Amino acid sequence: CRYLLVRSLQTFSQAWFTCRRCYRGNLVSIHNFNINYRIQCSVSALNQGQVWIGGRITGSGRCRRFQWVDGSRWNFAYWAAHQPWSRGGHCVALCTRGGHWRRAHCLRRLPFICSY
């Protein structure tokens, strides 16, 4: 899986369409632990504690159906302790320290990982 770290802080939608606009891809869609580690390796120097990825807790009310923007299936997740319920927004963000996933509010401006 090819992935590119963009260091500019942008909202989720911004990042999503930024990946599509600049590199013709999407926000990274992680499907195993290897990619999660390599992506964790690429975000070991980021001061920002989190980075956006393609995850979406998209559910009408309380359906809370995790889904990737890229459309790929949702078969893997590396959730942090005390996650991912009763906290956070609708958009997922990978914690730079450790590599565990979080739930963040989409309007937050954080670095992101573009796939290509």
23/115 Cα distance (integer angstroms): 8
User: Does 108 interact with Cl ion (rule: CB under 5 A)?
Assistant: no
Count of residues interacting with Cl ion (CB under 5 A)? 4
User: Does 90 interact with Cl ion (rule: CB under 5 A)?
Assistant: yes
Q: Which of 46, 106 has the CB closer to Cl ion?
A: 106
User: Does 106 interact with Cl ion (rule: CB under 5 A)?
Assistant: yes
User: Does 88 interact with Cl ion (rule: CB under 5 A)?
Assistant: no
3-state secondary structure the chain: CCEEEEEEEECHHHHHHHHHHHHCCEECCCCCHHHHHHHHHHCCCCCCCEEEEEEEEECCCCCCEEEECCCCCCCCCCECCCCCCCCCCCEEEEECCCCCEEEECCCCCEEEEEEC
Residue closest to Cl ion when measured from CB atoms: 89
Minimum distance of Cl ion from residue 22's CB (angstroms)? 24
Q: From the list 89, 100, 108, 109, which residue makes contact with Cl ion (rule: CB under 5 A)?
A: 89
Residues engaged in binding Cl ion (CB under 5 A): 89-90, 105-106
